[PDB]
Design an enzyme around this catalytic site. Structure first.
Site, PDB file in Angstrom:
ATOM      1  N   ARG A 119      -2.597  11.079   6.387  1.00 53.27           N
ATOM      2  CA  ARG A 119      -2.733  10.340   5.140  1.00 53.27           C
ATOM      3  C   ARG A 119      -4.124  10.326   4.561  1.00 53.27           C
ATOM      4  NH1 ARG A 119      -1.221   4.273   5.511  1.00 53.27           N
ATOM      5  NH2 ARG A 119      -0.892   4.456   3.265  1.00 53.27           N
ATOM      6  N   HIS A 158     -11.111   4.996   2.495  1.00 51.31           N
ATOM      7  CA  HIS A 158     -10.426   4.484   3.677  1.00 51.31           C
ATOM      8  C   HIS A 158     -10.625   2.965   3.754  1.00 51.31           C
ATOM      9  CE1 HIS A 158      -8.320   5.662   7.363  1.00 51.31           C
ATOM     10  NE2 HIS A 158      -9.236   5.099   8.128  1.00 51.31           N
ATOM     11  N   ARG A 198      -5.714   5.717  -1.102  1.00 52.00           N
ATOM     12  CA  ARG A 198      -4.568   4.824  -1.202  1.00 52.00           C
ATOM     13  C   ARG A 198      -4.545   4.143  -2.541  1.00 52.00           C
ATOM     14  NH1 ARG A 198      -4.601   7.065   2.940  1.00 52.00           N
ATOM     15  NH2 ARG A 198      -4.697   6.233   5.056  1.00 52.00           N
ATOM     16  N   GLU A 208       0.817  -1.219   0.000  1.00 51.76           N
ATOM     17  CA  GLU A 208       0.000   0.000   0.000  1.00 51.76           C
ATOM     18  C   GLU A 208       0.847   1.264   0.000  1.00 51.76           C
ATOM     19  OE1 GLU A 208      -2.045  -0.252   4.361  1.00 51.76           O
ATOM     20  OE2 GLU A 208      -2.102   1.686   3.347  1.00 51.76           O
TER      21      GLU A 208
END
Length: 96
Positions: A65, A85, A69, A54
């Site tokens: 963050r 998320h 992702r 990741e």
């Protein structure tokens, strides 16, 4: 389960940035970038440990963050976006 495919151009531009850093093997903005992703909700196809990694996709303005992702799979051209998320993922198509 994977929520379809999405063109790279349809994602935030930071997704393109993250993929460019992956192509260069970093360096990455966050220390967690490149850590193994365990697929603990079995959301992605079952693979052995280390198949997935990741990387942060930066959210403009965020101190942390945030929620975005990219998860790489070991297969060629196998990359998953999530904008929520890790709740859902879509396969990223770099050809469009």
């Amino acid at each position: 389960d994977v929520s379809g495919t999405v063109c790279l151009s349809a994602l935030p531009p930071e997704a393109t940035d993250t993929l460019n850093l992956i192509a260069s093997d970093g360096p990455f903005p966050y220390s967690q970038d490149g850590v193994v992703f365990q697929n603990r909700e079995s959301v992605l196809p079952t693979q052995s440990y280390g198949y997935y990694h990741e990387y942060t996709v930066i959210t403009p303005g965020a101190r942390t963050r945030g929620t975005r992702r990219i998860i790489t799979g070991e297969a060629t051209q196998e990359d998953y976006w999530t904008g929520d998320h890790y709740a859902t993922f879509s396969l990223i198509d770099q050809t469009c």
